[PDB]
Ligand binder design. Structure first.
Ligand SMILES: [Cl-]
Ligand SMILES: [Cl-]
Ligand SMILES: [Cl-]
Length: 163
């Protein structure tokens, strides 16, 4: 575990993370995809061998010894708000299990279902609160990666508000 487990947020490409493993905002079919998923495919393409996994689940594949945790959030274009909310919470619970199993001291994580899978809605708070629900009982240092300047400020505020 980390000596004083923390949450942090950085505004940069999660492919450049400084953590012991990465969570991919994966599609169910293990395809290169778009956004975070394409950056992850360019950086760790070896991790997409047999990475396909259903919605609401996480599947880890090693790139050398570097673990890539493929977490499949729901696409809110296809799911009802209710069912999508349940699957988005479940994906993060499976990320917490994998992070624990791997014995890492740190993890780089994007906000699942907030980009192309958002169904055109702002899901920062929804996705971040499910991240916290899952990760709060883990002792890894969590570093959240985002690309938007206003999202960085809002994520930072939410982290600092609970300290
Ligand atoms: Cl960058
Ligand atoms: Cl997304
Ligand atoms: Cl963002």
């Amino acid at each position: 575990g980390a000596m004083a487990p923390s949450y942090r947020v950085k505004r940069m490409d999660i492919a450049k993370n400084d953590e012991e493993c990465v969570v991919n905002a994966a599609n169910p079919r293990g395809l290169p995809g778009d956004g975070v998923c394409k950056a992850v495919y360019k950086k760790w393409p070896e991790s997409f061998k047999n990475s396909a996994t259903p919605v609401g689940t996480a599947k880890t594949v090693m790139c050398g010894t570097y673990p890539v945790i493929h977490a499949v959030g729901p696409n809110f274009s296809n799911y009802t708000e209710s069912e999508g909310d349940r699957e988005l919470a479940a994906a993060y619970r499976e990320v917490a299990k994998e992070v624990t199993r791997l014995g890492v001291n740190s993890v780089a994580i994007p906000l699942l279902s907030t980009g192309v899978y958002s169904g055109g809605k702002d899901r920062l708070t929804q996705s971040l609160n499910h991240l916290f629900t899952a990760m709060d009982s883990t002792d890894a240092d969590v570093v959240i990666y985002c690309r938007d300047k206003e999202w960085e400020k809002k994520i930072s505020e939410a982290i600092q508000m609970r300290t």
